[PDB]
Amino acid sequence: YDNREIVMKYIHYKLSQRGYEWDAGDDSEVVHLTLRQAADDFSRRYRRDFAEMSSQLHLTPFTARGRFATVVEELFRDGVNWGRIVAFFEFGGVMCVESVNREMSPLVDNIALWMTEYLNRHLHTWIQDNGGWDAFVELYG
Ligand SMILES: CC1(C)CCC(CN2CCN(c3ccc(C(=O)NS(=O)(=O)c4ccc(NCC5CCOCC5)c([N+](=O)[O-])c4)c(Oc4cnc5[nH]ccc5c4)c3)CC2)=C(c2ccc(Cl)cc2)C1
């Protein structure tokens, strides 16, 4: 599977669903559909967390990378599982929405890059060794 495509299709779905434009996301698919529905379910179960995160990020172009790294380290500090990976995608979405809300749309390209590099380097071994995206689809698809 393709981590860049998974990130691109997720961020495009989340932003387009809420009326936000991301030019670079303008457009195997059972993975995208499964992640979409898992993420939407996560968002519904933890709306209060979705709301507190959006209201406190306080992004600027120079602090965006540090805010992303700080949250993602805390998310995986106790270990990785599929639910924390889904939460990682939803947090990336929140970062992208808040970037546009604060007139920093170019930051969406950076956030998508950071998310991809994170799957490619930090989370890669865990995802592969726990069955890859195919296991994720079999468990939650
Ligand atoms: C600084 C911070 C670190 C502070 C903390 C927080 C917020 N926290 C993050 C961690 N969190 C977690 C973590 C793990 C799990 C879990 O059970 N893990 S699990 O057992 O592996 C699994 C279990 C079920 C499914 N799927 C169900 C299917 C049912 C049928 O429909 C399809 C889906 C999956 N799965 O992967 O799909 C995997 C979980 O519970 C659930 C429950 N329901 C879920 N539905 C989808 C995912 C999911 C997880 C919730 C709780 C909220 C921060 C925060 C804030 C805002 C944003 Cl925006 C983000 C983060 C920041």
Helices 47-56 and 82-101 cross at an angle (nearest 10°) of 40
The sign of the dihedral angle between the CA atoms of 125, 74, 17, 36 is: positive
Q: Give 83 Cα–ligand 1 centroid separation in angstroms.
A: 4
Residue nearest to atom 44 of ligand 1 (CA): 42
Domain ranges of the chain: 1-141
Experimental method: X-ray
How many other C-beta atoms can be found within 10 angstroms of the C-beta atom of residue 21? 12
| 68: amino acid identity, one letter | F
Q: Give 127 Cα–ligand 1 centroid separation in angstroms.
A: 16
How far apart, in whole angstroms, are the C-alpha atoms of residue 72 and residue 61?
A: 18
| Burial class of residue 78 (count of CB atoms within 10 Å of its CB; 0-12, 13-18, 19+) | exposed
DSSP-derived secondary structure letter, 131:
T
> In 3-state terms, what secondary structure has residue 47?
helix
- Output the ligand 1 site: residues, CB below 6 A: 37-38, 41-42, 45-46, 49-50, 53, 71, 74-75, 81-84, 86-87, 90-91, 94, 140
The reported resolution of this PDB entry, expressed in Å, is 1.8
